[PDB]
Design a binder for this molecule. Structure first.
Ligand SMILES: Cc1cc(N2CCOCC2)cc2[nH]c(-c3c(NC[C@@H](O)c4cccc(Cl)c4)cc[nH]c3=O)nc12
Length: 116
């Protein structure tokens, strides 16, 4: 069984996380936890049972809260899947999510291969 030091996951995965953040305007809806009242979508938690966003993912990676790197992959897809569930398939935020997901699928593959 691989043993992953927090510092190894941090340095290896941070560039993939930067690749999501740097997408402008597509990353903006994902940068902070969804605030249903401020956004005027009060049925958000009626639909999304487990919220996830970039700031949470970034904190876990920065402070060493992942035991193994596929939990980071889990959190990223949970964030995308939340957005694809709540938002209609042709809407702006659905398309934004799809753009971030395209970037991620591309960046994460070689990084996960090198982590073993
Ligand atoms: C690539 C892709 C495209 C799309 N759609 C494109 C068309 O438009 C609608 C959205 C939805 C996706 N959902 C998931 C997904 C996971 N993927 C792992 C993959 O990253 C992966 C798998 C093995 C090795 C590595 Cl290194 C990385 C894992 C857990 N739960 C998930 O839902 N992947 C999706």
């Amino acid at each position: 069984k691989k043993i992953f030091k927090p510092e190894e996951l941090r340095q290896a995965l941070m560039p993939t996380l930067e690749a999501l953040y740097r997408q402008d305007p597509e990353s903006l809806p994902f940068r902070q936890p969804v605030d249903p009242q401020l956004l005027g979508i009060p049925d958000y938690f009626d639909i999304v049972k487990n919220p996830m966003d970039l700031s949470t993912i970034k904190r876990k990676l920065d402070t060493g809260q992942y035991q193994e790197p596929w939990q980071y992959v889990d959190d990223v897809w949970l964030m995308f899947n939340n957005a694809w569930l709540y938002n209609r398939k042709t809407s702006r935020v659905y398309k934004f999510c799809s753009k971030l997901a395209e970037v991620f699928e591309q960046e994460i593959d070689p990084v996960m291969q090198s982590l073993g």
